[PDB]
Amino acid sequence: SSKYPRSVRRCLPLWALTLEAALILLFYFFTHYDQKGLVASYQVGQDLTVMAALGLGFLTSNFRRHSWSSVAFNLFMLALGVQWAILLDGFLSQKVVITLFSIRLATMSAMSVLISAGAVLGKVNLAQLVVMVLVEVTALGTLRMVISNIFNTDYHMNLRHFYVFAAYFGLTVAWCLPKPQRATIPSLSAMLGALFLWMFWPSVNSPLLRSPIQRKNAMFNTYYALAVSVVTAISGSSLAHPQRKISMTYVHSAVLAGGVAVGTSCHLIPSPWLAMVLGLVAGLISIGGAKCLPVCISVMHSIFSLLGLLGEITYIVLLVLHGFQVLLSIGELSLAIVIALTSGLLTGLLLNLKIWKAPHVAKYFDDQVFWKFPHLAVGF
Amino acid sequence: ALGIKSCDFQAARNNEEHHTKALSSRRLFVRRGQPFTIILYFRAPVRAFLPALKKVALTAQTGEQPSKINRTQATFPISSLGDR
Amino acid sequence: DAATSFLRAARSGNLDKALDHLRNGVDINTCNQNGLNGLHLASKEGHVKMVVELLHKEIILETTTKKGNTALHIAALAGQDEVVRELVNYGANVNAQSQKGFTPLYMAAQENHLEVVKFLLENGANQNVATEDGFTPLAVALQQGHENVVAHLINYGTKGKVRLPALHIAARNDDTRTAAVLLQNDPNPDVLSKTGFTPLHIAAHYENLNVAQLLLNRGASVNFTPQNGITPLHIASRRGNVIMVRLLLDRGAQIETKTKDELTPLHCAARNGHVRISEILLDHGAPIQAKTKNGLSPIHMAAQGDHLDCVRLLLQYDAEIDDITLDHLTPLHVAAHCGHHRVAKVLLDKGAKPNSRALNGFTPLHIACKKNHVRVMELLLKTGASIDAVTESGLTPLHVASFMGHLPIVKNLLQRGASPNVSNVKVETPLHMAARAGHTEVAKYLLQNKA
Amino acid sequence: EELQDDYEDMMEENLEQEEYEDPDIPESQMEE
Structure with missing residues (x-):
C-alpha cells in the first residue's frame, strides 16, 4: 500500500457540499423561526460554543505535528454537528422551532461528538470525522428518545448522560481503528484550551435546569469541585509518573475531573463541602487511573470514561437520599452504555471502509497528510 | 471445458538440469530449491487463459500421511505472483 | 483499450494479465495521460514482482512522467522500500532530478521515510542537491519536523557510496537477468568498486559461471x-x-x-x-x-x-x-x-x-x-x-x-x-x-x- | 541482515586481498 495520501480533491468537497445542501434543504422544509432576558439566555449558549470551539479544539492540539488538523477539524465538526443536531432533535422530539435554547441543546449534542473525537484525532481524515459526527449525533438522539419513551423522562433532559455516552463512543470508535509526540507551544495552546474549558464548565453543568435556584447551586458545586480537582490533579501528577515530574498532558485532561464527577448531580448537592469531597475523589481517581490504566489507546479518554462512570455512580448514590429508583437509574445507565458501545462499533466499522481514503498508519498525527506546505513534491 | 489429457514431466531435460541425468531419463529426479519444467496437455482447446489459470491449483504430497504442519503437503496456485 | 487494461493490471498488481497483454503485443512503454507507465504504477503500489517482470521486459528504466518523476522518485515518495531497493539494484539513478528539482532523497526525506533515506544515502544519493527554490532534503526534513530524518542526514553527512556497484552485487548473486538489464543500461562491464575490482573478480571469487560468461561476452x-x-x-x-x-x-x-x-x-x-x-x-x-x-x-x-x-x-x-x-x-x-x-x-x-x-x-x-x-x-x-x-x-x-x-x-x-x-x-x-x-x-x- | 555482501568493506574482507601477498620470510634467529 502507498503511504502517500490519496487525492481528496473530489471526495471531500463533494461530500461536504452535498451535506451542506442537504442541511439547507432540510432547514427550508422543516424549520421555522421562534425577550426581557434574551442576552442572559444567549450567554449560556455562547459559553457552550466558546468551550466547544476553543477548549475542545486546542485541548487535542498538544500533538507535535497535528495541531492544525485538531483545531480546524474540531471547528468543522462543531459547525456540522450543531446544524445536524437541530434537525435531529426537532425530528425525535415531535416542524422545528429554532430558539436559543434549541441552539444550546444542539451545541451540547455537538460537544458530545467533539469529546468523542479526541480519542480518534490524529488517525482519521475529515470525511471519517463527518461520518462519525452524523452517526454519533443520530445515536445520541436515539438514546435520548428511547430513554424518554421507556423511563417517561424528557427528551431534552436525557442529555445529562452525554459525558458517559461521548466517552464510551469515543473509546469504541478508537478501538476499531487500525493500530499506529509533544511540543512546548502546542502544549501551551492545549493549556489555554483546558483553561477555557475549566472556567466555563459550570455553564455546561447547568444548561438544562429551568429554575434559577438549581442553576445557581449547580454552578456553585461545579466551581468548587473544579477548583478542588485542579488542586488535586496538579498535586498528584508527580506521584503517578516514573520521572517524578508534573505531566502537562495529564493536567490538561484532569483539570475537568471534578466537573465531570459532579456534572450529573450538581443540583442535588445540598452543600459545597460535598461538592469539594466529590472533586477530591475525582482527582484521586484520575491519579489512580493515570497510574494504572496504561498498564491494564488514549489514556485521557479512558480516565474520562472512568470519571463519567464515577459521576453516574455518585448520582445513583445521591438520588436515593433525595429500590425501584436505583433499578431504573441503573437500567438507564446500562442502556446508555450498551447503545454507546454498539454505535461506536458501527461507526468504527464504517470508518474502516476504503472509500474514505483514510491516512496510512505510518502517517498518523501529521498535518502533512491534510494540509498544504511549501517546498513539497506534490503528485507523481 | 478444462479437461486434462496428459502431463509430460520432461524427465530427461530436468534430470540433466538438476544433475540427476545418471539416475534415469524416464523418472523425474529433481533437487529442492531449483525449478523444473512440466508440460500439461488438455483434451480440448482452452478458450480464455486467465479464468482457466484461476481455476487450477497444484498440490504436492509426500509420505503416507501428508499434512501442511509436517510440511509434507503444499497447495499452490499456478500464477506469476507465487513465491519462487 | 488493451493498453488501458495493461496499465490497470500494473496498478492493481495483476501480473498475469499484464504478461498476457505483453504477449498479445501491447507496447511495454505505454503510459496514461499523466505519463505514468506500467513501471511507475507498479512502483507506486509496491508491486515488487511486477517491477521485476517489467524490467525483464526491456522497459525504459529512466522514463519520466509529466512532472519529471522517474520510477525511483515515485517509489521514494510512496514509501516503498522494497521497490526502491529493486530499482536501485537494476540501475536507477539515485541523483535524478524532476522538473522542479526534486530528488528521490528529497521525496523520501519530506515524507518521513527513514528507511528509504538510509538506503539512498548508502547508495550514493547526494543530499547537497537542491531544488529550484534552493531547498535541500535536510531543509525540508527540518521544516516538516521529521526529527529522525534530520538526525540521520546530519550524522551521515558525506560518507558517500558505501554499497557495491549494482553489477558487483549481480555478479555476487549470479543474477543473470539483473546483470543483463544493468549491461543494457550501462554498456561498460568493467565498472570499478572502491577497492578497484571489476565484477569479473567477484564472479571468479564465487565461481558464478553464468554471470562471468555474460560479462566476458559483453566485453569484460x-x-x-x-x-x-x-x-x-x-x-x-x-x-x-x-x-x-x-x-x-x-x-x-x-x-x-x-x-x-x-x-x-x-x-x-x-x-x-x-x-x-x-x-x-x-x-x-x-x-x-x-x-x-x-x-x-x-x-x-x-x-x-x-x-x-x-x-x-x-x-x-x-x-x-x-x-x-x-x-x-x-x-x-x-x-x-x-x-x-x-x-x-x-x-x-x-x-x-x-x-x-x-x-x-x-x-x-x-x-x-x-x-x-x-x-x-x-x-x-x-x-x-x-x-x-x-x-x-x-x-x-x-x-x-x-x-x-x-x-x-x-x-x-x-x-x-x-x-x-x-x-x-x-x-x-x-x-x-x-x-x-x-x-x-x-x-x-x-x-x-x-x- | 543477510545483505552485508552488498557493501564495500564486507566484500573487501571476503575477497581476502592479504592472501595474494607474500607475508614474510620466517627466519627466527636463535641468538638472544
Missing part, C-alpha cells in the same frame, strides 16, 4: 589488473575454482601475470593445495620456477601449507627440489620449520639434500630441533642428516635443542649418540645453553648422560 577484460596486481585468474586459482580457471584460460587469461608481491597464479594454487588448478596451469605453460619478492617458488608455497599432493604434482613437473629463497631456505627447510613431516618425507624420498645450509648455516635438522618437531628430526636422521652438523656459529642440533628446552628432542639426540661435549664459537657447551635459559630437566639429562 579477462586480464584486468588493478593496482595490487590481482587478476581474476589469480582469484580463481586461489579460491580453488577449477571450472572458472578453465573458463578464464579459454577466454585468454595471461598465465605469467604477477601481483605486487610477484605471486603468479601457480603460487596461489600451490599455497592453497589446489592440485587440479596447478596441473591445468602447468599444462597451459605456467612457469614452475617463478619466484616471489622473497624468492619463494610454488613448491615453497605448497610445502608451507602442508599440501602433500601439490608437492607431488610439482615434483612430477620437474620442479627444483632444492630451490632456495633469499634466505637460502629449501622446501625441506620450510617443511622442517612448519613441522610437516609428510612433505619432508616426500622431498627426501625424491633426492632432497638433508644437510642443506641456510644463510646462517642452519640445516633442516637444526630447524626441526629448534621448533620441537620430533617427527621431522627422525625422518631427517633416517635419511642421512648429520647429527653433529654445525652452523656458522658452530651450533649443533643438541645446542639448539638444549637452548630451546625441548626435552624429548634432547633425549632422542643423546640416545642416538650425540656428544654433549661439543662447543660453540663461544666455546659454550649444550650444558651452558641449558643453564643460561633455566632448563633444569634438560641440564639434568645432559649431566646424567655424559656431562
Whole structure:
C-alpha cells in the first residue's frame, strides 16, 4: 500500500457540499423561526460554543505535528454537528422551532461528538470525522428518545448522560481503528484550551435546569469541585509518573475531573463541602487511573470514561437520599452504555471502509497528510 | 471445458538440469530449491487463459500421511505472483 | 483499450494479465495521460514482482512522467522500500532530478521515510542537491519536523557510496537477468568498486559461471589488473575454482601475470593445495620456477601449507627440489620449520639434500630441533642428516635443542649418540645453553648422560 | 541482515586481498 495520501480533491468537497445542501434543504422544509432576558439566555449558549470551539479544539492540539488538523477539524465538526443536531432533535422530539435554547441543546449534542473525537484525532481524515459526527449525533438522539419513551423522562433532559455516552463512543470508535509526540507551544495552546474549558464548565453543568435556584447551586458545586480537582490533579501528577515530574498532558485532561464527577448531580448537592469531597475523589481517581490504566489507546479518554462512570455512580448514590429508583437509574445507565458501545462499533466499522481514503498508519498525527506546505513534491 | 489429457514431466531435460541425468531419463529426479519444467496437455482447446489459470491449483504430497504442519503437503496456485 | 487494461493490471498488481497483454503485443512503454507507465504504477503500489517482470521486459528504466518523476522518485515518495531497493539494484539513478528539482532523497526525506533515506544515502544519493527554490532534503526534513530524518542526514553527512556497484552485487548473486538489464543500461562491464575490482573478480571469487560468461561476452577484460596486481585468474586459482580457471584460460587469461608481491597464479594454487588448478596451469605453460619478492617458488608455497599432493604434482613437473629463497631456505627447510613431516618425507624420498645450509648455516635438522618437531628430526636422521652438523656459529642440533628446552628432542639426540661435549664459537657447551635459559630437566639429562 | 555482501568493506574482507601477498620470510634467529 502507498503511504502517500490519496487525492481528496473530489471526495471531500463533494461530500461536504452535498451535506451542506442537504442541511439547507432540510432547514427550508422543516424549520421555522421562534425577550426581557434574551442576552442572559444567549450567554449560556455562547459559553457552550466558546468551550466547544476553543477548549475542545486546542485541548487535542498538544500533538507535535497535528495541531492544525485538531483545531480546524474540531471547528468543522462543531459547525456540522450543531446544524445536524437541530434537525435531529426537532425530528425525535415531535416542524422545528429554532430558539436559543434549541441552539444550546444542539451545541451540547455537538460537544458530545467533539469529546468523542479526541480519542480518534490524529488517525482519521475529515470525511471519517463527518461520518462519525452524523452517526454519533443520530445515536445520541436515539438514546435520548428511547430513554424518554421507556423511563417517561424528557427528551431534552436525557442529555445529562452525554459525558458517559461521548466517552464510551469515543473509546469504541478508537478501538476499531487500525493500530499506529509533544511540543512546548502546542502544549501551551492545549493549556489555554483546558483553561477555557475549566472556567466555563459550570455553564455546561447547568444548561438544562429551568429554575434559577438549581442553576445557581449547580454552578456553585461545579466551581468548587473544579477548583478542588485542579488542586488535586496538579498535586498528584508527580506521584503517578516514573520521572517524578508534573505531566502537562495529564493536567490538561484532569483539570475537568471534578466537573465531570459532579456534572450529573450538581443540583442535588445540598452543600459545597460535598461538592469539594466529590472533586477530591475525582482527582484521586484520575491519579489512580493515570497510574494504572496504561498498564491494564488514549489514556485521557479512558480516565474520562472512568470519571463519567464515577459521576453516574455518585448520582445513583445521591438520588436515593433525595429500590425501584436505583433499578431504573441503573437500567438507564446500562442502556446508555450498551447503545454507546454498539454505535461506536458501527461507526468504527464504517470508518474502516476504503472509500474514505483514510491516512496510512505510518502517517498518523501529521498535518502533512491534510494540509498544504511549501517546498513539497506534490503528485507523481 | 478444462479437461486434462496428459502431463509430460520432461524427465530427461530436468534430470540433466538438476544433475540427476545418471539416475534415469524416464523418472523425474529433481533437487529442492531449483525449478523444473512440466508440460500439461488438455483434451480440448482452452478458450480464455486467465479464468482457466484461476481455476487450477497444484498440490504436492509426500509420505503416507501428508499434512501442511509436517510440511509434507503444499497447495499452490499456478500464477506469476507465487513465491519462487 | 488493451493498453488501458495493461496499465490497470500494473496498478492493481495483476501480473498475469499484464504478461498476457505483453504477449498479445501491447507496447511495454505505454503510459496514461499523466505519463505514468506500467513501471511507475507498479512502483507506486509496491508491486515488487511486477517491477521485476517489467524490467525483464526491456522497459525504459529512466522514463519520466509529466512532472519529471522517474520510477525511483515515485517509489521514494510512496514509501516503498522494497521497490526502491529493486530499482536501485537494476540501475536507477539515485541523483535524478524532476522538473522542479526534486530528488528521490528529497521525496523520501519530506515524507518521513527513514528507511528509504538510509538506503539512498548508502547508495550514493547526494543530499547537497537542491531544488529550484534552493531547498535541500535536510531543509525540508527540518521544516516538516521529521526529527529522525534530520538526525540521520546530519550524522551521515558525506560518507558517500558505501554499497557495491549494482553489477558487483549481480555478479555476487549470479543474477543473470539483473546483470543483463544493468549491461543494457550501462554498456561498460568493467565498472570499478572502491577497492578497484571489476565484477569479473567477484564472479571468479564465487565461481558464478553464468554471470562471468555474460560479462566476458559483453566485453569484460579477462586480464584486468588493478593496482595490487590481482587478476581474476589469480582469484580463481586461489579460491580453488577449477571450472572458472578453465573458463578464464579459454577466454585468454595471461598465465605469467604477477601481483605486487610477484605471486603468479601457480603460487596461489600451490599455497592453497589446489592440485587440479596447478596441473591445468602447468599444462597451459605456467612457469614452475617463478619466484616471489622473497624468492619463494610454488613448491615453497605448497610445502608451507602442508599440501602433500601439490608437492607431488610439482615434483612430477620437474620442479627444483632444492630451490632456495633469499634466505637460502629449501622446501625441506620450510617443511622442517612448519613441522610437516609428510612433505619432508616426500622431498627426501625424491633426492632432497638433508644437510642443506641456510644463510646462517642452519640445516633442516637444526630447524626441526629448534621448533620441537620430533617427527621431522627422525625422518631427517633416517635419511642421512648429520647429527653433529654445525652452523656458522658452530651450533649443533643438541645446542639448539638444549637452548630451546625441548626435552624429548634432547633425549632422542643423546640416545642416538650425540656428544654433549661439543662447543660453540663461544666455546659454550649444550650444558651452558641449558643453564643460561633455566632448563633444569634438560641440564639434568645432559649431566646424567655424559656431562 | 543477510545483505552485508552488498557493501564495500564486507566484500573487501571476503575477497581476502592479504592472501595474494607474500607475508614474510620466517627466519627466527636463535641468538638472544
